Amino acid sequence: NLEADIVIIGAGAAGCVLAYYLTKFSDLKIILLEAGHTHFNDPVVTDPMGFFGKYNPPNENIRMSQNPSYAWQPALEPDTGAYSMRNVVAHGLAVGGSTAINQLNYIVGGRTVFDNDWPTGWKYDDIKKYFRRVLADISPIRDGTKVNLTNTILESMRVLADQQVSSGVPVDFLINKATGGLPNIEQTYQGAPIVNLNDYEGINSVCGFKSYYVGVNQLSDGSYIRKYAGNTYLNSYYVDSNGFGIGKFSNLRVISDAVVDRIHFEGQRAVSVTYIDKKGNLHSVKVHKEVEICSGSFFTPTILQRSGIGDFSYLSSIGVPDLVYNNPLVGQGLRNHYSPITQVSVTGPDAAAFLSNTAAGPTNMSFRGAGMLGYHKLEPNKPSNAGSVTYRKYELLVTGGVAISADQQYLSGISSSTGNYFALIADDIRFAPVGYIKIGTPNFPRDTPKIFFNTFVNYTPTTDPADQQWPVAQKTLAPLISALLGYDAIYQIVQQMKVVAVNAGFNVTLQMAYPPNDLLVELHNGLNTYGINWWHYFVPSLVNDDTPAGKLFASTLSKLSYYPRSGAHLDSHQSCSCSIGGTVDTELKVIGVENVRVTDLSAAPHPPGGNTWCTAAMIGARATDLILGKPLVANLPPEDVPVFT
Amino acid sequence: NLEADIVIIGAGAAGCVLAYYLTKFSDLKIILLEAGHTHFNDPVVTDPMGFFGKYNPPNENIRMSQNPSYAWQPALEPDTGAYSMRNVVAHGLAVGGSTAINQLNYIVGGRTVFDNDWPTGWKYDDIKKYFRRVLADISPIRDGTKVNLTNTILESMRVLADQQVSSGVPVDFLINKATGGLPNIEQTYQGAPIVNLNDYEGINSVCGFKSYYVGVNQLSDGSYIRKYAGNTYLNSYYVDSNGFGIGKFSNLRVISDAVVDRIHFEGQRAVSVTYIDKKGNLHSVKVHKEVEICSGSFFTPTILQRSGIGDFSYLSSIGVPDLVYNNPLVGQGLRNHYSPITQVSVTGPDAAAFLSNTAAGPTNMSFRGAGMLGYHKLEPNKPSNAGSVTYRKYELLVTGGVAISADQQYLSGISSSTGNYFALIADDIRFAPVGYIKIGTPNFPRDTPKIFFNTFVNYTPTTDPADQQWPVAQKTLAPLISALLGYDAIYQIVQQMKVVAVNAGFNVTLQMAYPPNDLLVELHNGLNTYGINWWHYFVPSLVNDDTPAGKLFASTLSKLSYYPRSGAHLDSHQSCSCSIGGTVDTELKVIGVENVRVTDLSAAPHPPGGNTWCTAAMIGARATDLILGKPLVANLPPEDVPVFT
């Protein structure tokens, strides 16, 4: 018999925090049903370079995000906006969840997004303590080596932002209003004082800096290691090697390899939970007080439908045997970030000397900065607070080498064989597309549910007058407009790059190859000759302009639109699957029953401003507080860390 | 049952002093866990000549520093700076510790080193009483026989120091600023008043003298004996032949043959200690008040890691079962002295008459003086107080016969078969290299832990501009620069030797053979033609001088650098393994718990100016005071000695 009252389902980035601190300051019984094992000895997972295939045997050079021993492999339905191609994205399969197989970034999400996007009691001032706690527990590290590329970028940014402060435009992309009127770009000289983008009081929404924060820890020996949720919260110091708590944590049980099917359910008080061991046997943990769901964005709603709470007509049509509650918002409104790709060529006598120290390393991992921007001026879909508050919209990145897939490499002909390349990425942060998740089999936890996520749907003109069908075209074309404005943003930095590199004693030439520059200069001409109505030319049938200028600009837009659909990566940064206000209240509690609550990244009512690791950790901390009834994690001193072994 | 509250681990040079005086002025219970036996009857250890193999049977002529019946035999990891060769150095194994197998020298360490190198409460004025006490307890003896070699050396030194006083240079190597501006060189005639380098008020940092102080005592019969920590503090007069105290010392127990594994540990108050008898049985001494660690530089940190206090991640990775405190400075920062070697040849009608009375004896033991010097003028790594205070840097020595290993003897072809040789040694005293100690087996006291100690690492030029990579080359090349300047110092005395020997009615010729003189005269020419920037030519790739002069000088440096790596001895004078400020406070107390303190030579935050025997004795005396709470050893009259039997 396996009676319990604390029942966590999944040791993700939020499961570990919740379980660790809940067991630290409470003496209930805790079972953590995890379905993965602890890769404490696997050299590929500990060494960060193993992320880049140092240990793969020659036959099978793949990344852990694809390997089925490491990650769940859902396959999404075809994307009607990207030529009906189906993507595979990964939830982790290990203690610590996705953190075991991630890229280790720590962007906390600025003041603006939570203050004006999150409900009462979750404002930036109400949770920033939790964020301090988690960034303290990890204690990530930066790189401190010089690279002339980042300096070039940041001085070009200063050049351009000085024009932007003048001319009085209130929402241009290099503007910050917490710093008076000017974002604090990091200085450019030996040992300049650093800019920390994750500042405690969220001063910097827009800024420029020079390296990122990754979850490594330099060891005394000289080798760097992965530092993740399983590594910190649940290691040999607290949990027995068989899955039992140690001393102070004695009421803490970890069933490592256990997939939960559903939560058996009585009255409206869920009473029991079923799991399947590796040896094939069902068991049942009895539930006395509560159950916890921390099983990722994708699988959490599936757990809920199989449990019994969800849309009755659909679930009955597929044939789940038990119905509990009719909540037709279960698992709705998924979101994610997106990232197109852009290349540059270099042509000069000493360009090889201009790009040294750009190889990925154990501290940088193929990152060289290099900024974070806001809305472009000519963006039409901005919130009403754009004028008085600055928003985090574009997440600039930079890397050496080639990032485009080998097919695009064949098409453009630009290969890493000819060494003149580096990539700039504008990771959209406020991406619009919204999708939903269902199940197709009421049987067991699969590896692929129904996932619909359509991105770049083009507009179909109708016979309605243009005067009331522009404001549906706008909202349909939103992602295209945002991606194109990001293209403009990257395009209009490269010339300041040319200037500052020529003037810093470097004789090289910079010209974008993918996408080809000529398209972009034509776009710039069209933009600054057509004004805010530049986006009216996505649908040439509505403008009714036969002048060759507008015809050529619309043609340019048309041929350009191929590249965000083709040359991009889909971000793993899923979120927002069981949002507050949709299926749960501000207490994370599930609406319709009394003893089930969801406490993971699915509950976020809005996607945060960065790589969505820290937000889920925060949610775990806060949910610990909510179940506890009193704030202790908020009141713990910042400099107490869990032990590291 | 073996309950205790005073628990000393190891009867070293500091264990004996501590135990003896602690039991003299206190009435607690004292157990001294020693792991060795008392060589009171062994003729080889009592007779000082036995150090030089008078009693070895013909099959096994070895020295006690190698014999495993006498000394622990750690083997260091390969020295990357000396052609990856691994050294073996000895900690003693007997009551009295290393003193039983040592070379018997008494350099106390001058005013400068403790006053500006040791923390508050340990200044020279605050401890000099303890040093007086210990040098009084031993009462070493000198030689009083004439030898023309030492007179030659000292008059040459006078000659050169008179030039050095003029020319106004403030940090040249034959300068003393406590004696106005001139070191007090010992006179040269019959029965001249002696210069005692271990003066009570530390007037002489730099000086010249004519014989050393050794731990013998002339007996009434006519035979000299070893006089050491076990001999003085713990002999038949105070301790029973079974290991029990006598009368006044009745609360004093000596378990002679007992190796301590770890200190069993409760809460944060260590409670018990385990040892292994010769007959194979574990026992346990209960600890009521404190435990004492006096088990040498090497083994003390090992005791600490096996006990439980140390770096958690490393110790957990190797698998010690218990963790107590996370102090990642345990056993860091080892230091030691170093000693290259140099030969001279003599060619003249009466040279045999010039070197009589240089055979080692029971009072000299192969020493014939002969000085102690400070920084050379052109040394770049000097402390900021070099100008206003004189520092002890080079420990000159001299001996008859050949000192180079038989392989070097084959290579140079100079053997003691042709009788024209004596050696000059410049024992570096402020040597830079720093290493660290770990353990590899959490099982029992081994004979060899992980020891890393890299000395002569050469610089690897990079693509950084020279203007900011000279001050990393300097600090990397420091030991090379110091050794080379010592070579210059010895080289530029031999010509004054030629002069004073020719002018004192002796017709002989002096010329260095190993290293060959021609290298050294080329070095002198390069030094005085290149100035302080003579060391820029270690890395010829940075100077960018193609003039044959600089090319030849850099070549000379390159070929010379072979000899300090090859023809030298490693000093046994380990120190500084658990320094004050690193793992203990000014009370010697270990940081993290309440009842364990380290009181041996590992705690020294800086290496003293001489053969590191007297310093550990001082530390024992002071720690007696610290545990006592009142100064009595400081207040004992100087002329009370413990009884000698």
Ligand SMILES: Cc1cc2nc3c(=O)[nH]c(=O)nc-3n(C[C@H](O)[C@H](O)[C@H](O)COP(=O)(O)OP(=O)(O)OC[C@H]3O[C@@H](n4cnc5c(N)ncnc54)[C@H](O)[C@@H]3O)c2cc1C
């Ligand atoms: C390729 C990749 C790159 C990434 N890059 C970054 C980056 O640059 N920066 C960054 O900050 N983050 C990065 N991440 C991490 C990611 O952005 C978040 O850290 C992730 O959303 C963590 O959320 P979570 O822990 O709540 O969800 P999850 O980690 O998905 O939690 C789900 C957990 O529950 C377990 N589970 C699922 N179903 C069951 C079941 N039925 N029974 C029992 N257990 C179950 C799973 O095994 C898993 O351990 C990356 C991730 C990936 C895969």
Ligand SMILES: Cc1cc2nc3c(=O)[nH]c(=O)nc-3n(C[C@H](O)[C@H](O)[C@H](O)COP(=O)(O)OP(=O)(O)OC[C@H]3O[C@@H](n4cnc5c(N)ncnc54)[C@H](O)[C@@H]3O)c2cc1C
């Ligand atoms: C070859 C040689 C030449 C020397 N020459 C000179 C010289 O010219 N001048 C000079 O002044 N000094 C000389 N010395 C001595 C040396 O410089 C110092 O005297 C030495 O550092 C004394 O320090 P210590 O007594 O604190 O350490 P140690 O003597 O090393 O103390 C360690 C003691 O603890 C014991 N012990 C270790 N582990 C355990 C355990 N687990 N359980 C119980 N007991 C244990 C050991 O048996 C030993 O008795 C020489 C030494 C050697 C070996």
